[PDB]
DNA sequence: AGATTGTTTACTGAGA
DNA sequence: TCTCAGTAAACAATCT
C-alpha cells in the first residue's frame, strides 16, 4: 500500500464529472476510465490501479446508478453508469487538502 | 484461456 | 482517536 500523487479530487467527484459532461449523461466503465485519464493526464501514465479504485467507487456510492445495457440479461456486463447528483455528499466535490494540492476549487458547477 | 466487469472484503494512512 | 477516501485484491459471472 501507498498513496499516489493523484489530482486533488475524489474519485467520486471525477467520475461524477465525466458522467455529467457526457452527451446522454451516462457512460460505460470503459468510457469513464478513458475520460478521466483525458481530463487528468496523471492517469494516462504507468500506474493502473486507479482503474480498480474507480470501478470500486461505482459500486460503493448510491449516487452511482447502473442502468443495464440490456433490460433482459440483468447479469450482463458493459452497462451504462449514471450519477444521481442529489445523492452526492457535497464535500466530496471540493478540492482536497492533501500533499498534491499544497479546473477549480469546487466541482459543483460541472455536475449540477 | 485469459480479460473485463460488478461486487465485495480488508486494510491504510492522512486529516479532522 | 476516529473516520473514511484511497488502494489492493478475491471472487463470480460474463465477454472476447
A111-to-A31, A45, A82, A91 alpha-carbon distances in Å: 17, 26, 12, 13
Q: Which three cell numbers stand for residue A72?
A: 433482459
E strand intervals along chain A:
64-67, 80-83
Cα A95 from Cα A25, distance rounded (Å): 23
Nearest alpha-carbon partner for A64 in A90, A83, A36: A83
Residue with cell 449516487: A63
By C1' distance from the Cα of A92, the closest nucleotide is: C5
Q: Give the determination technique.
A: X-ray
Q: In this structure, are residues A16 and A88 in contact, taking their beta carbons and an 8 Å threshold?
A: yes
DSSP 3-state of A8: coil
Q: Look up residue A101 and give its DSSP letter.
A: T
Cα A53 from Cα A56, distance rounded (Å): 5
Residue with cell 442502468: A67
Host H or E run for residue A82: strand A80-83
Displacement of CA A16 from its chain's centroid (Å): 5
For chain A, what is the radius of gyration of the CA atoms?
Answer: 14
Q: In this structure, are residues A26 and A49 in contact, taking their beta carbons and an 8 Å threshold?
A: no
Q: Is the CB of A59 under 7 A from strand C?
A: no
By C1' distance from the Cα of A79, the closest nucleotide is: B5
Structure resolution, Å? 2.1
Q: In this structure, are residues A19 and A79 in contact, taking their beta carbons and an 8 Å threshold?
A: no
Domain A11-90 indexed as CATH 1.10.10.10: yes
Amino acid at each position: 500500500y501507498q498513496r499516489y500523487p493523484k489530482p486533488p479530487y475524489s474519485y467520486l467527484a471525477m467520475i461524477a464529472m465525466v458522467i455529467q459532461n457526457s452527451p446522454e449523461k451516462k457512460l460505460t466503465l470503459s468510457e469513464i476510465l478513458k475520460e478521466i485519464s483525458t481530463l487528468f493526464p496523471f492517469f494516462k501514465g504507468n500506474y493502473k490501479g486507479w482503474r480498480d479504485s474507480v470501478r470500486h467507487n461505482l459500486s460503493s456510492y448510491d449516487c452511482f446508478v447502473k442502468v443495464l445495457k440490456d433490460p433482459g440479461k440483468p447479469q450482463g456486463k458493459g452497462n451504462f453508469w449514471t450519477v444521481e447528483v442529489n445523492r452526492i455528499p457535497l464535500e466530496l466535490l471540493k478540492r482536497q487538502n492533501t500533499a498534491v494540492s499544497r479546473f477549480a476549487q469546487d466541482l459543483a458547477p460541472y455536475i449540477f
